[PDB]
């Protein structure tokens, strides 16, 4: 996305979102015209993942833990979720 | 393909711009250059009218003249003129007119009659190898008849 | 603001056709799309800036048009296709008879 006229390799441009345009702040040429606003079970191996999710969720409830902690634990489980270094471990050790 | 299989735009019923049916008209290397230069004559004729208020050299020296007459960017037309002179082998339009009258007598579809004029061969078999259209529509002997008649007219100008 | 349908009708009763069109196209969402002259659908793969159009499926490459329509209309047609109805768009009165 570059100004044909001004032609600076890092293009100093501005987005006049209120007009929905994109402008070469140097020469003033408009570059793009319409700015799209945007602002407003077994076939997947997530079966074990969701079992872990449900147990994790109920445990988070029991602990009264923040949703951020719940998400962090879910993400950590997803990060491992399978390994020889895991090798089973009762599926509750990994939850904890 | 080359077996008389041409699109809608190249059917027999070539409706002239007056809105009526007419026969398909094709051009070989026996009329193309001899009509193009003639039309260029009219072109230059109006070009100077409204302005008021061997064959090789006759090809290109006048090609540049009508390049002056035309818009000149049509040098590919000049390529076609060159291709004509190199492989269009008729002159004195009455020559080719007798040829075409004979080919009208042949009862041949105009595509085939153009095939004959365009090609310069020796036997009916050479034609059948080049023109699968022209293999049996007439006696192969008559093919060689008219090929020989062409060779009689086959004089380089 | 919304140029509601009752506005459309008022603007009709005035007979101001040109204005109505302007509102509905240049004011909002004019969109240009190519069209197969045979299949009558929007499938033309207009490799523009090469003039290569090639509605395969009809394997056309020559008989092709571009039109201007509201984008929402193009969208509507694509939705109809997705629902399996083909709204073929033909740019001439179908009088072969």
């Amino acid at each position: 996305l570059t100004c044909p006229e001004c032609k600076v390799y890092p293009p100093k441009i501005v987005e006049r979102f209120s007009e929905g345009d994109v402008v070469c702040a140097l020469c003033g040429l408009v570059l793009s015209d319409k700015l799209v606003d945007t602002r407003s079970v077994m076939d997947k191996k997530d079966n074990e993942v969701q079992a872990a999710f449900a147990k994790i969720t109920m445990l988070c409830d029991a602990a009264e833990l923040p949703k951020i902690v719940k998400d962090c634990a879910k993400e950590a489980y997803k990060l491992c979720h399978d390994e020889k270094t895991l090798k089973g471990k009762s599926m509750e050790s990994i939850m904890a | 393909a080359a077996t008389l299989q041409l699109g809608q735009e190249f059917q027999l019923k070539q409706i002239n711009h007056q809105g009526e049916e007419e026969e398909l008209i094709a051009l070989n290397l026996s009329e193309a250059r001899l009509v193009i230069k003639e039309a260029l004559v009219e072109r230059r004729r109006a070009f100077k009218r409204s302005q008021k208020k061997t064959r090789e050299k006759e090809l290109e020296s006048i090609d540049v003249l009508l390049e002056q007459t035309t818009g000149g960017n049509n040098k590919d037309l000049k390529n076609t003129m060159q291709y004509l002179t190199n492989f269009s082998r008729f002159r004195d339009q009455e020559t080719v007119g007798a040829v075409i009258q004979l080919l009208k007598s042949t009862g041949l579809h105009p595509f085939e009659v153009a095939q004959l004029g365009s090609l310069a061969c020796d036997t009916a078999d050479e034609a059948k190898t080049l023109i699968p259209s022209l293999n049996n529509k007439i006696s192969d002997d008559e093919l060689e008849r008219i090929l020989k008649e062409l060779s009689n007219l086959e004089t380089l100008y | 603001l919304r140029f509601g349908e009752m506005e459309r009708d008022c603007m009709i009763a005035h007979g101001a056709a040109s204005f109505l069109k302007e509102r509905l196209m240049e004011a909002s969402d004019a969109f240009r799309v190519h069209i197969c002259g045979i299949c009558g659908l929007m499938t033309v793969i207009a490799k523009l800036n090469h003039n290569q159009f090639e509605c395969k499926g009809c394997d056309n490459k020559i008989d092709i048009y571009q039109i201007h329509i509201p984008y929402a209309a193009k969208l509507l047609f694509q939705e109809l296709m997705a629902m399996n109805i083909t709204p073929r768009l033909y740019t001439d009165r179908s009088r072969d008879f």
Binding site: - | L27, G71, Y83, L84 | -
Partner: protein, 171 residues
């Protein structure tokens, strides 16, 4: 292949040209954009006959742009390739897998698999030509080219020529 054709064209005439002499610019543009142009539907449009009697009937003003729309009918001559057809020609440049034969206004290419086996390619030669058991076929050589394939793309027709058959190669 050459044909006399009657073609219809629609020409848009921008308003500024609305003099008493519109037909001047009209015929002007007609020639400027019809003679010597390529169509996927008619082939290269070579020359136009009857420069005078051209049906120029009546304009239409597009509802916006105010530019008049004219439907010119005119009669001209076009050059159209066809598959399986036999032509003459001459090469322009070379390719590693064949050579491009300039059949007049258009250039027809012949590919490596499209040539007889004895016709081999010499890259060392200048210009790199194609050497048969009996023919060394060079840039200016006269090749009897047979039209095998044709591209019907609008504005650009491409033709596939081949000399694998008899009566081909040198004319």
């Amino acid at each position: 292949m050459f044909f006399i054709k009657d073609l219809s064209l629609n020409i848009t005439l921008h308003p500024s040209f609305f003099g008493p002499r519109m037909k001047q610019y009209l015929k002007t543009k007609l020639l400027e954009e019809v003679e010597g142009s390529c169509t996927g539907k008619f082939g290269y449009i070579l020359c136009v006959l009857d420069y005078d009697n051209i049906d120029i009937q009546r304009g239409r003003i597009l509802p916006t742009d105010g530019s008049a729309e004219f439907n010119v009918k005119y009669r001209a001559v076009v050059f159209k390739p066809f598959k399986g057809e036999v032509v003459d020609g001459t090469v322009v440049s070379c390719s590693q897998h064949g050579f491009e034969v300039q059949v007049g206004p258009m250039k027809v290419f012949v590919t490596k698999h499209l040539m007889p086996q004895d016709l081999t390619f010499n890259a060392g030669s200048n210009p790199p030509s194609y050497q048969s058991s009996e023919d060394v076929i060079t840039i200016k050589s006269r090749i009897r080219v047979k039209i095998e394939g044709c591209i019907s793309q609008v504005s650009s027709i491409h033709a596939i020529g081949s000399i694998k058959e008899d009566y081909l190669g040198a004319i």
